[PDB]
Design a protein around this ligand. Structure first.
Ligand code: ECB
Length: 135
């Protein structure tokens, strides 16, 4: 029973964010700033209802969803694309498919210990992020 992802989470590692951004066609000036940043993620979860805020000194990104309910997602201030997003549970892993112009786009997020893991995929690029829970 580890579906409860509530909390404030501070990034401790960010593997291949460069490759994931390049797969999304982010220009190199934007990548040069974005690759260096520590992100914070705030998850406010009530059952299958999620309100999430991911923040940094450069850009912030909010996304709210209900697990199992497809929604329109506009990745404002990121790659600025429109996708149809669906989040589901696979066991206790939160899985998102972002259907749109990029193949194999989505993410998976899950808890282990006091760490949150987030793997973001676009095409043949996977970015692996780890966050530690803030007290
Ligand atoms: C929002 C902080 C980082 C922003 C970096 C700025 C520009 C880079 C442009 C594009 C890269 C694409 C995505 C950023 C990667 C992660 C932020 C969270 C994305 C997301 O949907 O996470 C889900 C799962 O945690 C939010 O519910």
């Amino acid at each position: 029973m580890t579906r409860d992802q509530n909390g404030t989470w501070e990034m401790e590692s960010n593997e291949n964010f460069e490759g994931y951004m390049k797969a999304l066609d982010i220009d190199f000036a934007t990548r040069k700033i974005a690759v260096r940043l520590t992100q914070t993620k705030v998850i406010d979860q009530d059952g299958d209802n999620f309100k999430t805020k991911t923040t940094s000194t450069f850009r912030n990104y909010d996304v709210d969803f209900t697990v199992g309910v497809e929604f329109d997602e506009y990745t404002k201030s990121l790659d600025n694309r429109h996708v149809k997003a669906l989040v589901t549970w696979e066991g206790d892993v939160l899985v998102c498919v972002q259907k749109g112009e990029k193949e194999n786009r989505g993410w998976k997020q899950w808890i282990e210990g006091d760490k949150l893991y987030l793997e973001l995929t676009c095409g043949d690029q996977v970015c692996r992020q780890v966050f530690k829970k803030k007290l």
